[PDB]
Design a protein around this ligand. Structure first.
Ligand SMILES: CC(=O)c1sc(CCOP(=O)(O)OP(=O)(O)O)c(C)[n+]1Cc1cnc(C)nc1N
Ligand SMILES: CC(=O)c1sc(CCOP(=O)(O)OP(=O)(O)O)c(C)[n+]1Cc1cnc(C)nc1N
Ligand code: SF4
Ligand code: SF4
Ligand code: SF4
Ligand SMILES: [Ca+2]
Ligand SMILES: [Mg+2]
Ligand SMILES: [Mg+2]
Lengths: 1231, 247, 123, 123, 62
């Protein structure tokens, strides 16, 4: 039978998908990843599908690969499913045509997510699923967590009986990550609904050599059209089949559905047609408004394809005079969005009454669709009746938006308690909120709903939880805007965010802070808050969560205290039961290590309940003195755009605020100064050997070396301690290691590697450091950076260069950013970056924080994110542009040399042409040209003067993670490197798909634990470097900052200067690897990665062969035997040891064996005497010739495929045999 | 001036595409192959485009690779074109959203060909071009060998001035391979129709470390929707621009 | 043994034996082959070919290398050799043939081989 | 034993006739004789080197193990299971049903650094 | 739409929209859907709109 459960849309549908499928081909993409991961976990735990078998799941190299495997699996007679979204669904489109064209019962579960256009978005809308509406797949929408479960089941059953593949979809995040208490069917009940005759027919018609057939033929005009129409019967019947299964499932669950469902006044005059989670919020509003006499209604679209106009009309009240169709997408240039056009077709074909039909757009990229907005929509139908409108934004550019009145009354059912929790990443708030949802749902008749807003910031980010509990079903698919309970778990928020926004009168406000004394509170708590607390007679509670946690021994960990606060003050449960339930569950969870860690939590609760007293505030708060604006100076863009966004007001920025093409300017992160490190380094100048390694190693550019001349230190603060500069070249300069304490993330890598025993860097609390260092860094930032003093590519020298990628949203201690920071210090001013989607694009450019910046001269990396799969080709394109445009420039130069241009100009041109591709010479002469041709606007010299941004040789780089490089973009990477063109590929190998949640990649090593390799990966790590080296003309190298910063810089210079393709693979530490002693040990782990032989460093340089020397050089020494401790020092390996000690020992021994073999192979490579060495290049010369020119026999066929304008000449088509055979037959036949 | 010649839809189109482009990323697929092969042979023969430059053409590993290259070339300031159809066009779809989304003057010449479903067909119909109707590309059809030449030119001129990528298409075989005596314009005539200011502007806004910007950001619910609607003013001007160039 | 089950279970329609009797087209171990040209294997389908080979599963890939995209009209591919004339290689290809074989051999667990009927039918 | 085996012999020197016997090569000789001559010589050298490399592969005593499969056994484990510091971030991308539990997010420095700060700030 | 109507004769009583494609399960093919929407938004006269499919895979259209 049934079973109650609180879960999200994802697990609700994965629950059914696992039961109904035998095979699944998958690939990770947010927000669908959860489904595949749960399927893998369940299969590993032993869960059986309806056939008593565990699922056969496999991760492909991309969604295109999964789609092909799904097709093959179905073709070969196995029920198959997949989970995907957005960009991924797009890659599956070609196979969708094949899967439906071949009438295969496949089922795709899609979490509708936005497609990347002017920008990428992981959030929800229907752009992706609408992009596939013509593939022939049936499309069934579910609008709630409970509907996801039901529709997933209907889709599968219907796909099996109808033979038409189905795409079951639900809104990304809004439905996929929303938690609800729902009911799910047993697998046995699902099995009982399966049409057995159909299943057997599927099996019998499938591919099998015992009774073969041919599929995928190529057809000519004589029969293609007929063959395409032969499936009609099937599409005509699918609708009735879907209704039939909606009915059968209803007899088991009690929840009925129709292809189109209607809710609202039966005599409604104004109706809305919508699809997805929006239907839930719309219905809630209808209940509220209809109860006031409003004649409104809603038609919920279930089956979107095939579109059965008859079922649409069955749901349409004849009284409707105005109908608004809501589309959750945007098709630029179309006369209207999909659903709108479908509805219009229904009315014209019916050819009768024509009510006013309006089209409306909403919810792009999970944009809120709230009750107020629904009111706007309904008001519009009785008022202006604006058409093709937008709602949810202010379109002050084209004026397509409906105005929205946010005073609209709360419409949640009577008796709904709404909660909001403001937490700090990793403080356990979300996990506590989820527990409270399970606890409450399992122990009451209350409906529970939870949704979570996260931060683009991976570290120290803010989280906002929205929970609702009630006696009536919760249809609020929108954030809480009028909360009964608001908890602010981080005191730093009090003064920076509008935390009490919309909280109800007499509402409860809990704050975690050490401001126990009325004087303390008055001191820290701002006025706006005080006035709000006072004027709304809010039950304000304060609690030093940090002091209690410490006191009971929980070491300042606040989750349990704030959890107790919720259970005690939220008012969803009675004091007794709540405290009881909370405790019972504490023994439930925990209980693992003795009752000692159980007592501390039990105690923490007891103490919390006691300390949880209603803070009393003076009635004078009613009008506290509004404070001033002690805000520093910044950009107009940071003031008008990013600041508003960073403080949760982006929703108020109108369209006029953004660039039509989605671009953002560089360096907006320079002003964020979040200051979230708990501990920051403290420079101890007495111990400093002035090496600059600390700045080189910082993942966030938080360390600023200073090299000043006496005169520059004049107004220097008293505490701006500077050492006399060590070094022959620095004789006379003052040196300083200035810590940027607000941008520091407090990872500790710098301090960890600082050379001297008596450390020159020591971690101290942020407070003990800011007052002194904030003004100091601000003074230093104004001291010219001495880039001309030392070699740009020397360890010390590089840090005397301007880093052009700073303060990114990467995790504290991230292993990727140090590498990227250094590269900019070496080529930043003349580079192009084609960045593959991934962590690097995420910390690289999450609006509105832009970490890449320009130097003092305005130059900086031209950075761009195309897609996840095409970074290499994207960069290759940029390289094609430069080739074309710089060749055009060269041609103008050469022409100008043969004109009456002045001797100076001519000398400069000649110099540029000669040094065209040299960074030093091209800039030297190009710079003379900007001067000489300044002002020239006419003729040849004019064109040349207008092409100055093309004078100095550019550096095209392609940045990407291992998932990009070894998997999805490998084919493109391989082709680009094989092109022999001058591009630079930098691969940050984290040995997993990091950004998406640690999924295994072909770069994942043997024995490593990761998603889809949860028992340890059972295939060795793909050898991308050795594969690329077979080309012979591509520069290939490996690096590891921790092992050698010099070898890294050497590699950087040699790769970039190579006049061909370059590939550099770097070892990148990541939080997913689980470094046991913290990410601050990254540099040391990189060091060990190399020494252990786990990550050998080498270089393959084709130009050495061009001079009789071996292109391959080993840069590290043989395995030193430390691999075992290197692996055990990472949880990705250690967990397997604790869980499967037997197989883990074996897998770690295999790694040591593989690396030992590999090192030995690299050794003969370096010892070899055989290698590719001929001519550098040469050739060309205008002219083309066709491979068929002058052939003795036909060189092309009779096919339409080879027909060309010039083809058609008579030729010997090889039907008379060899030239000799014909000759001999000629002789023999003489006559 | 004008010039009488007897050729097919493919060549009539490629004749214009070569003249109006600086860069091309290609991949072979019937019935559009002729165009790319032609553009390649002409480049190797030294034919000059309207800028007196021979075309920079490279063959990718697939159409997806080709489309990514086209996106990159456009992003970096070069006028770019590509030739495709059917299955190839489908693989270009992800990039089409990015190309129209960043408002780039790209021009795709497509020989409309059927999509492989119950079977593969190299023949003509609009299944492929309809599959890309929501990518944001303007779509201009030519129904005859003579129109292929004219629309190809309108498409290029209109893309440059409007900043909206264009998909110029004609029927696979029925037009791409039909031979007709028609009139083509000299490259000089085409060059004189080009909006020199729009062109300079396209180059000034392109990617360049000398005056950088960030493109392809990742955006949250707070601003994505507004950002997607910001291009409306460009799509509103497209119709007028096409009509102007037709005239 | 599968052929013996076909005779022993002929007629079985009920229970376990019936279910087994209905699965005879699965008794004999099958041979899964993947056919394709060099354009597929060295270019467009390379990433999937690579991924599938790395999977370690039991499949057989047979590549008919014509050193060009033949069907479409002789366009060059990464399998096209140095100096060979083909569309997009109008003055003879200026990059050498991609070594697909040596690239795949780097896994160590994939069986790789090259053949040429004209030289040895036995090999 | 060595997995790699060479089935043909060292170049016999007839490569030039081989190429010239095919129009894809000969046509270049007739149109760009100088470049053709260069490229055919480049091919001859490329194969010379390749064969020599295949001969080393065949004569090497350096190679790795092999086993079809086995081991894993029922059960799986999350890579974050019992880690000392957070293994996931504050991103909606890494969010999962079971995530949300407090952990050391690496903003307080290393274990050792944290430990030494405790020792020093004791009080 | 404005340009579409500038081309439609006011005398037109029946209009057939020909689509050279097939979208299985769609209430209509693309061009047809676009034209229907044109008439619906105009709000005036509603001639009979007919949808027809032709020319798939180069099928003759004589
Ligand atoms: C944002 C987006 O949708 C990301 S982030 C990226 C992670 C890749 O990891 P890689 O190892 O290359 O780099 P890392 O994160 O540094 O480890 C993936 C799988 N995708 C999801 C995804 C899936 N499939 C496709 C076609 N496109 C996208 N964008
Ligand atoms: C008929 C069809 O559309 C063929 S025939 C094939 C030639 C492949 O050559 P390969 O060397 O792999 O094999 P060969 O012919 O035996 O030499 C191509 C390029 N395609 C065209 C093509 C292009 N791009 C995409 C995505 N799909 C297809 N089907
Ligand atoms: S602790 Fe980490 S973020 Fe802070 S200055 Fe040191 S390396 Fe940079
Ligand atoms: S790592 Fe230490 S010794 Fe080196 S420059 Fe930095 S503070 Fe000084
Ligand atoms: S690579 Fe790892 S450590 Fe760096 S930002 Fe990504 S998840 Fe964080
Ligand atoms: Ca290079
Ligand atoms: Mg990675
Ligand atoms: Mg071939």
């Amino acid at each position: 039978g049934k079973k109650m459960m609180t879960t999200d849309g994802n697990t609700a549908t994965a629950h059914v998908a696992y039961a109904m499928s035998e095979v699944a081909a998958i690939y990770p993409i947010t927000p669908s990843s959860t489904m595949g991961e749960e399927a893998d976990d369940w299969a590993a735990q032993g869960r059986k599908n309806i056939f008593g078998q565990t699922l056969t799941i496999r991760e492909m190299q991309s969604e295109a690969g999964a789609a092909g495997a799904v097709h093959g699996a179905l073709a070969a007679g196995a029920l198959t499913t997949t989970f995907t979204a957005s960009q991924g669904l797009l890659l599956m489109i070609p196979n969708m045509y094949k899967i439906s064209g071949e009438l295969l019962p496949g089922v795709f579960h899609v979490t509708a997510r936005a497609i990347a256009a002017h920008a990428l978005s992981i959030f929800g809308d229907h752009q992706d699923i609408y992009a596939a509406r013509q593939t022939g797949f049936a499309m069934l929408a579910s609008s709630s967590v409970q509907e996801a479960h039901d529709m997933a089941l209907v889709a599968h059953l219907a796909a099996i009986e109808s033979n038409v593949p189905f795409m079951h979809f639900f809104d990304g995040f809004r439905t996929s990550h929303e938690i609800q208490k729902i009911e799910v069917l047993d697998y046995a009940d699902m099995a009982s609904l399966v049409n057995q005759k159909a299943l057997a027919e599927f099996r019998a018609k499938s591919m099998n050599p015992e009774h073969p057939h041919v599929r995928g033929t190529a057809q000519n005009p004589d029969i293609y059209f007929q063959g395409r129409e032969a499936a009609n019967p099937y599409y005509l019947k699918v609708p009735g089949i879907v209704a039939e299964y909606m009915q059968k499932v209803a007899s088991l669950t009690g929840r009925s559905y129709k292809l189109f469902d209607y809710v609202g006044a039966p005599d409604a005059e104004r109706v809305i047609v919508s699809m997805g989670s929006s239907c839930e919020t719309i219905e809630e509003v209808i209940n509220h408004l209809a109860a006031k006499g409003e004649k409104i209604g809603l038609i919920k679209v279930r089956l979107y394809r095939p579109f059965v106009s008859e079922a649409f009309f069955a749901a349409l009240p004849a009284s409707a005079k105005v109908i608004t169709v809501l589309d959750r997408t945007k098709e630029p240039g179309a006369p209207g969005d999909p659903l709108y056009l479908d509805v219009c077709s229904a009315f014209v074909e019916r050819g009768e009454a024509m009510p006013k039909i309006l089209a409306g757009r909403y919810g792009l990229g999970s944009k809120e669709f709230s009750p107020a907005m629904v009111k706007s929509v309904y008001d519009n139908m009785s008022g202006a009746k604006k058409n093709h409108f937008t709602v949810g934004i202010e379109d002050d550019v084209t004026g397509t938006s409906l105005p929205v009145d946010n005073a609209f009354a709360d419409t949640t059912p009577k008796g709904t308690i709404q909660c909001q929790f403001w937490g700090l990443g990793a403080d356990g708030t979300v996990g506590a909120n989820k527990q409270a949802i399970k606890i409450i749902g399992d122990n009451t008749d209350l409906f529970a709903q939870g949704y979570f807003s996260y931060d683009s910031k991976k570290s120290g980010g803010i989280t906002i939880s929205h929970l609702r509990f009630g006696e009536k079903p919760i249809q609020s698919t929108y954030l809480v805007n009028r909360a009964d309970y608001v908890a602010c778990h981080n005191p730093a928020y009090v003064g920076i965010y509008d935390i009490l926004e919309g909280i109800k009168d007499g509402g409860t406000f809990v704050l975690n802070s050490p401001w126990s004394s009325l004087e303390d509170m008055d001191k820290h708590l701002p006025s706006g808050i005080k006035r709000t607390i006072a004027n709304k007679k809010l039950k304000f509670y304060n609690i030093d969560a940090v002091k209690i946690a410490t006191d009971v021994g929980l070491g300042g960990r606040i989750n349990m205290i704030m959890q107790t606060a919720f259970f005690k003050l939220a008012g969803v449960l009675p004091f007794e039961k709540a405290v009881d339930l909370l405790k019972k569950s504490i023994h439930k969870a925990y209980g693992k290590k003795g009752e000692k860690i159980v007592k501390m939590n039990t105690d923490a609760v007891d103490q919390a309940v006691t300390s949880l007293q209603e803070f009393k505030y003076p009635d004078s708060w009613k009008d506290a003195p509004a404070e001033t604006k002690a805000e520093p100076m910044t950009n107009e863009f940071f003031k008008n755009v990013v600041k508003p966004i960073l403080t949760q007001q982006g929703d108020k920025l109108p369209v006029s605020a953004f660039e039509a093409d989605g671009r953002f300017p560089l360096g907006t992160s320079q002003f964020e100064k979040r200051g979230v490190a708990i501990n920051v380094p403290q420079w101890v100048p007495e111990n400093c050997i002035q090496c600059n390694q600390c700045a080189f190693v910082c993942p966030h550019s938080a360390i600023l070396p200073v090299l000043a001349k006496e005169e520059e230190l004049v107004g220097a603060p008293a505490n701006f301690t500077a050492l006399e500069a060590k070094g022959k070249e620095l004789k006379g300069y003052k040196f300083r290691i200035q810590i940027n304490t607000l941008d520091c993330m407090g990872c500790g890598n710098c301090a960890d590697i600082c050379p001297p025993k008596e450390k020159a860097l020591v971690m101290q609390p942020l407070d003990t450091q800011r007052d002194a260092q904030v003004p100091n860094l601000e003074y230093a930032a104004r001291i010219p950076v001495k880039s001309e003093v030392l070699p740009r590519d020397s360890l010390k020298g590089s840090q005397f260069q301007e880093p052009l990628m700073e303060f990114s949203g990467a995790c504290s201690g991230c292993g990727e950013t140090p590498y990227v920071r250094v590269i900019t210090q070496l080529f930043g001013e003349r580079m192009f970056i084609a960045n593959a989607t991934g962590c690097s694009s995420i910390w690289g450019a999450s609006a509105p924080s832009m970490p890449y910046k320009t130097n003092r001269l305005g130059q900086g990396p031209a950075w761009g994110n195309s897609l996840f799969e095409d970074a290499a080709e994207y960069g290759f394109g940029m390289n094609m542009s430069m080739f074309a445009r710089r060749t055009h420039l060269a041609d103008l130069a050469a022409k100008a040399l043969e004109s009456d241009a002045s001797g100076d100009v001519k000398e400069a041109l000649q110099g540029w042409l000669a040094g065209k591709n040299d960074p030093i010479k091209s800039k030297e002469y190009g710079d003379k040209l900007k001067k000489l041709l300044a002002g020239q606007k006419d003729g040849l010299l004019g064109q040349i003067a207008a092409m100055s941004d093309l004078y100095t040789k550019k550096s095209v780089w392609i940045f990407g993670g291992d998932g990009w490089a070894y998997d999805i973009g490998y084919g493109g990477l391989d082709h680009v490197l094989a092109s022999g063109e001058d591009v630079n590929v930098f691969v940050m190998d984290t040995e997993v798909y990091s950004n998406t949640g640690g999924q295994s990649s072909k770069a994942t090593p043997t024995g490593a634990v990761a998603k889809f390799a949860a028992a340890g990966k059972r295939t060795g790590k793909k050898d991308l470097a050795r594969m690329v080296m077979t080309y012979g003309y591509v520069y290939v190298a490996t690096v590891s900052m921790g092992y050698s910063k010099q070898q890294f810089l050497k590699v950087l210079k040699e790769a970039e200067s190579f006049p061909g393709p370059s590939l550099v693979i770097a070892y990148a530490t990541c939080i997913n690897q689980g470094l046991r002693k913290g990410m601050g040990k990254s540099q040391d782990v990189m060091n060990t990665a190399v020494k252990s032989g786990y990550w050998p460093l080498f270089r393959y340089d084709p130009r050495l062969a061009a001079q009789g020397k071996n292109p391959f050089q080993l840069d590290s020494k043989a395995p030193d035997g430390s691999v075992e401790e290197f692996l055990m020092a990472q949880n990705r390996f250690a967990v397997l040891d604790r869980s499967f000690p037997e197989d883990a020992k074996r897998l770690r021994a295999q790694v040591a064996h593989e690396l030992d073999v590999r090192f030995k192979e690299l050794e003969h490579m370096a010892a070899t005497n055989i290698f590719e060495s001929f001519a550098p290049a040469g050739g060309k010369a205008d002219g083309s010739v066709d491979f068929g020119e002058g052939a003795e026999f036909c060189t092309r066929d009779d096919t339409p495929m080879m027909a060309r304008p010039d083809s058609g000449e008579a030729c010997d088509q090889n039907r008379a045999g060899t030239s000799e055979q014909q000759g001999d037959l000629s002789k023999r036949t003489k006559k």
